[PDB]
Amino acid sequence: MKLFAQGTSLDLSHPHVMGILNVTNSLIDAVKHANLMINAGATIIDVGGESTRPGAAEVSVEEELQRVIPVVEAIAQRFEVWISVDTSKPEVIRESAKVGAHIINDIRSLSEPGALEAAAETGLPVCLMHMQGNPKTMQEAPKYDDVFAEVNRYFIEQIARCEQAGIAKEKLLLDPGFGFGKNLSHNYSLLARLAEFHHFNLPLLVGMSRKSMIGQLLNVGPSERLSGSLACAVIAAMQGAHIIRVHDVKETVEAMRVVEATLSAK
Ligand SMILES: Cn1c(SCC(=O)O)nc2c(=O)[nH]c(N)nc21
């Protein structure tokens, strides 16, 4: 199982670590941070210029472009590392793809006007992430009769939706979107059953690093969540998750090596 973008490949026979690069000189700090994460073992750098927090004061297209496009550009013309962009906006999708982005990672699964078509036209791999509702309001009262089933259903529908717009099944990644319209129980239900999302035969991407599913369980703030975060990463990778999105790269890469050695021996 592989992915193809910008004339190179990503080999998903083992877990990859995705380093979070939040951009909210700005440009000099970001490149350094991307460098430190590449050295630490990160093979994808995730550039994100719009807060996805439950607060959610949305940003303009011009400001998202200002924050994201120079950073993606800088990274693609130094390093060989794959680059993913956290955007919902078709112009950011178009523009970051031109300057060398490899993966469109949209928390809204290309639901914005023109986003689906803009993604189609780039030919780049697209991540389909589940969220109930939208960021402004998703956390007030998350509710499912059956969270696994509803997330499963969501991937069926979105995979079709992307196929119909001319994006090949081979381009898609799936992500049940931990913390995106989910309480603590919902999140752990999805993590315990994550291996069952393999039936789609698509790479699974997951993102639990320092999230409330650790914070609420341990009753600690965001800087005290590393052990819980590594536990979540290992639990997911043991179930065959292909990409782990994290803040703490060195520690996550160390944990993934232990998982790789374990899965080799099976
Ligand atoms: C942008 N983005 C965030 S932002 C919130 C945070 O970093 O806590 N979380 C995720 C995630 O879980 N999956 C994917 N695919 N993208 C994500």
Q: What domains are there in the chain, each with its CATH number?
A: 1-266 (3.20.20.20)
* DSSP, res 169: G
Which residue has 């065959």 as its token pair? Answer: 240
Question: Does 225 sit in the ligand 1 pocket, CB within 6 Å?
Answer: no
Question: Does 175 sit in the ligand 1 pocket, CB within 6 Å?
Answer: yes
The token duo for 81 is 């590392």
Instruction: Give 131 Cα–ligand 1 centroid separation in angstroms.
Output: 10
In sequence order, what are the beta bridge partners of 106?
A: 128
User: Taking phi first (over 0 means left), then psi (-120 to 50 degrees means alpha), and beta for anything else, what does residue 103 get?
Assistant: beta
Instruction: Give 24 Cα–ligand 1 centroid separation in angstroms.
Output: 15
Query: Rg of the chain over CA atoms, in angstroms?
Result: 17
Q: Distance between CA atoms of 16 and 240, rounded to whole angstroms?
A: 11
Q: Does the annotation flag 122 for ligand binding?
A: no
The torsion angles phi and psi of 83, rounded to 5 degrees, stand at -130, 130
The torsion angles phi and psi of 110, rounded to 5 degrees, stand at 60, 35
Residue whose C-alpha is closest to residue 194's, from 176, 182, 181, 167: 176
Residue 169 is among the residues annotated as catalytic for this protein: no
- Asked if 182 and 132 count as a contact pair (C-beta separation under 8 A), the reply is yes
* DSSP, res 181: S
Long-range contacts of 158-164 (CB under 8 A, 24+ apart): 158/109, 158/128, 159/128, 159/200, 159/202, 161/116, 162/110, 162/116, 162/120, 162/126, 162/128
In sequence order, what are the beta bridge partners of 123?
A: none
* DSSP, res 54: S
Q: Does the annotation flag 183 for ligand binding?
A: no
Q: Does the annotation flag 257 for ligand binding?
A: no
Residue 53 is among the residues annotated as catalytic for this protein: no
Q: Solved by what technique?
A: X-ray
Rounded to the nearest 10 degrees, the angle between the axes of helix 90-98 and helix 61-76 is 20
Q: What DSSP assignment string belongs to 4-21?
A: EETTEEEETTS-EEEEEE
Q: Say if strands 2-5 and 8-11 run parallel, antiparallel, or are unpaired.
A: antiparallel
Residue environment code for 66-103, b if the CB has 16+ CB neighbours within 10 A, otherwise e:
ebbbbbbbbbbeeeebbbbbbbbbbbbbebbbebbbbb
Q: Distance between CA atoms of 103 and 85, rounded to whole angstroms?
A: 6
In sequence order, what are the beta bridge partners of 244?
A: 17, 206
Q: Specify the amino acid at residue 83.
A: I
Q: Distance between CA atoms of 92 and 104, rounded to whole angstroms?
A: 10
The token duo for 146 is 């059956």
- Closest residue to atom 9 of ligand 1, CA basis: 207
In sequence order, what are the beta bridge partners of 16?
A: 243
Q: Which of 46, 107, 108, 131 to mutate to test the pocket of ligand 1 (most atoms within 8 A of CB)?
A: 107
The token duo for 215 is 């914070």
